[PDB]
């Protein structure tokens with residue numbers, strides 16, 4: 001729990017010293033802050049790659065004649081969703097976030113009690129269940145958090161990432 | 173036994189007082205009724221969602237010359253199966269119900285000895301294969317039992333559900 | 345490894361005799377005989393089902409110019425395989441058969457050291473991997489061994505079975 | 517560690533004599549040498565089979581205008597990958613190889629802490645994940661290491677193997 | 689705190705006008721000193737690289753198989769326009785191998801921050817006494833600090849259009 005996320009090459013890495021003080025709480029806070037940023041960023045780059053590869057759904061998203069094909073890839077997408085779609089995102093994802101399914105308290109050592117079936121194994125593998133798999137998911141987030149800072153600041157110049165791979169790949 | 177089923181955010185929820193006996197024996201039977209309406213309504217909503225997606229088989233269903241596309245979506249479908257087809261549901265399901273493979277003897281901890289393959293079984297995770305996964309299937313049933321009472325009443329007042337979704341979705 | 349196969353609603357069912365000898369050494373051999381006829385009949389019936397469904401491969405089988413569609417459905421298929429292909433069935437299967445990866449000779453509880461999704465060795469359910477799933481496959485063989493005695497006599501009329509189903513299904 | 521690999525019908529089989537030193541420290545190194553040549557040859561033969569079945573990707577590979585169909589089957593494929601692609605092989609594989617994830621160096625029983633279907637570390641059977649499934653993969657390499665010595669010599673005089681198989685298969 | 693450290697020397701002495709290491713944190717200081725030596729080692733190669741390219745000295749022959757030669761490639765930021773795209777990826781990547789796999793403390797036996805010998809390459813560091821060992825570290829730091837302002841000039845002045853070179 002403490003010894004987690006500090007595997008090689010960097011080890012424990014508090015460069016500026018913001019967990020230089022003590023408590024479990026602000027290390028508790030910043031961990032599940034980091035994990036939830038991890039979990040969200042990982043599905044957002046996999047959400048990015050499956051959008052930008054041309055994998056869509058046929059049919060209109062509403063009465064508008066807005067298809068899923070008419071919704072373009074990239075950052076015009078989430079904005080050009082119709083509003084009543086986004087308020088039904090905030091209803092469901094909202095209820096799923098706070099309330100249904102995925103408890104969020106203070107970062108409770110988030111266990112969520114599901115995972116699979118034969119997989120969580122304490123009583124079988126005390127270094128596979130935590131300290132490796134629980135370490136990688138942190139880092140796969142640490143890649144993907146650095147993927148979306150990437151994903152925005154690339155697309156801030158005109159070609160996006162399907163468009164950015166037909167023209168220029170070089171920097172400004 | 174007891175110590176299963178509902179859960180957060182309800183726990184033991186018998187608010188009208190139908191089971192407040194203090195007797196397990198009446199609670200045993202109504203549990204396995206709920207398991208069965210659990211299991212049936214679950215395969216009827218996913219049956220409903222796959223029938224409503226236009227997911228059909230090719231070819232005629234008989235020498236009546238009814239294709240699988242001819243049989244309409246919704247409540248009419250099971251009703252206008254040819255009668256000799258409805259006997260053969262009965263002949264097979266009825267054998268499958270009352271004695272073979274599923275035996276419902278008397279409502280008995282229908283355990284049926286179909287326990288996944290590795291997954292979700294004893295001599296592994298304690299929390300999961302019972303007191304959670306045994307609880308979810310029941311609550312999965314609890315969603316789908318309410319899904320059909322909906323679905324029937326959605327079909328009762330309007331046409332079928334795909335014809336409920338191209339026109340009005342608001343109430344009467 | 346003695347209490348194999350039969351079960352409710354039969355139990356030990358040896359209605360004619362030749363097995364109630366009081367010695368299991370003959371019961372020993374016939375049990376593994378039932379397993380192997382089990383294993384062969386089960387993949388022959390599903391082979392019969394997948395051949396009949398129109399599921400074939402593209403292309404010619406050989407320099408003969410016989411496609412995978414050219415070989416008829418039903419009994420005549422194995423007989424009019426070109427002879428050199430039947431030698432290579434004999435070369436590969438017989439090396440796999442009398443010798444190894446399967447090694448059958450001596451004939452009981454070879455076990456083959458091979459499990460399914462390799463689920464169900466041991467240190468799991470000791471009641472599901474032994475006495476039950478061991479019992480189904482043999483009983484699954486019991487259905488499929490009956491399926492072929494049928495199937496050959498169904499084909500014996502003078503068509504194949506898809507040409508038994510488009511015309512008459514009633515008895516002679 | 518010592519009882520591993522070969523098996524019926526050979527057992528320990530060192531016929532010319534290089535390894536019967538009485539000291540396992542050299543037997544140690546050559547074992548993990550055989551594992552890695554095992555692992556590489558097995559993905560190269562199935563790479564060779566999937567490349568030859570006509571299973572390619574759509575689109576050009578690069579600015580060159582080389583499609584995935586343009587790159588010929590067989591030996592010449594890896595040689596005429598454009599140079600900057602061969603570095604990005606050397607980039608990513610060489611990062612993945614020496615240390616980082618697969619960590620090979622030192623060169624014996626690295627173990628890599630990866631399971632198949634998270635199946636089979638331990639705390640199941642102790643007879644198949646050690647001494648059998650660990651034995652097959654090495655032997656699976658023993659087939660595939662011979663498969664490429666073949667494959668190169670099959671390609672050496674003859675064209676690519678799909679053009680070995682439409683003309684003559686017999687020896688020179 | 690760190691007034692007696694390396695790089696504190698005449699005429700300025702200990703010099704931290706921002707008070708960045710005024711808290712006395714060794715680990716913060718060890719980072720900054722490592723960050724200071726690292727830019728310095730780059731800038732010392734960067735100015736000599738800039739001056740020898742501006743003198744016209746090139747590697748012989750072609751940079752790729754398409755016939756693009758080194759002599760066509762100018763000095764400065766305009767070099768990156770004519771270095772081919774496969775070249776610019778490796779120049780970025782191979783230095784990242786030096787960042788990841790080579791130029792760091794791999795073994796943990798470094799006597800200080802920026803000691804990258806790793807028990808592998810040593811040209812006789814222990815043949816200097818402790819005052820010469822301190823002196824050669826003080827030269828490398830201050831040749832480093834000089835070149836950081838030196839290369840920062842030579843990059844700003846290429847963009848200004850006002851040359852500092854004859």
Ligand code: CLA
Nearest residue numbers: 730733734736737740741745746747758761762763767809
């Ligand atoms: C920060 C340092 C730096 C950077 C970014 C560059 C960048 C570049 N140089 Mg360059 N160069 C440098 C220093 C540098 N140089 C130095 C110090 C010299 C003097 C020897 C040169 C001499 C030089 C020539 C003669 C040419 C270039 C050219 C080029 C360009 C094409 C790449 C190439 O062929 O490089 C070639 C690089 C070199 C010949 C020398 C680089 C030496 C590096 C700095 C070694 C440092 C790391 C090393 C591995 C440390 C290990 C020690 C440890 C093991 C103990 C590219 C823009 C070419 C061009 O087109 O110019 C416009 C060209 O022809 N360079």
Ligand code: KC2
Nearest residue numbers: 061062063064081082083084085086088089090092093341
């Ligand atoms: C978080 C995933 C998600 C869930 C779990 C979920 C559940 C339900 C449920 C029942 C439980 C109903 C009954 C329902 C009904 C409608 N949803 Mg839906 N819904 C999902 C999310 C979105 C988004 C993004 C959009 C959307 C839409 C519609 C429209 C058509 C309106 C119209 O065209 O008139 C209708 C009727 C689109 C929209 O709002 O269009 C303006 C649109 O963008 N939904 N939705």
Ligand code: KC2
Nearest residue numbers: 233234235236253254255256257258260261262264265513
């Ligand atoms: C419970 C699922 C189920 C099972 C286990 C099962 C087994 C068999 C077997 C045993 C191996 C045979 C030989 C067989 C043959 C036929 N089935 Mg099938 N069958 C199943 C379900 C249905 C339904 C639901 C229908 C149906 C039909 C037909 C017709 C043509 C009749 C005709 O054209 O007159 C024929 C010949 C349709 C029908 O009866 O039409 C009047 C119709 O709705 N079946 N069926």
Ligand code: KC2
Nearest residue numbers: 405406407408425426427428429430432433434436437685
């Ligand atoms: C037991 C499954 C099985 C295995 C393990 C196996 C292995 C190999 C290998 C070794 C890797 C080669 C190189 C090879 C090549 C050919 N096989 Mg194949 N083969 C399998 C089975 C069959 C059947 C069942 C037939 C068949 C044929 C051909 C023909 C064309 C000959 C021709 O056109 O004259 C050629 C060239 C057909 C045939 O012999 O036609 C007369 C035919 O029925 N094979 N086969």
Ligand code: KC2
Nearest residue numbers: 169577578579580597598599600601602604605608609773
């Ligand atoms: C080891 C597997 C592998 C990894 C991990 C990886 C990573 C990345 C990343 C990092 C995320 C980017 C951004 C990227 C982009 C490009 N890759 Mg890709 N790449 C992979 C392998 C190959 C091969 C094997 C080739 C190749 C190519 C290209 C070309 C077009 C260049 C051009 O047209 O000039 C572009 C733009 C081809 C090529 O170099 O053409 C000369 C070629 O053969 N790649 N690649």
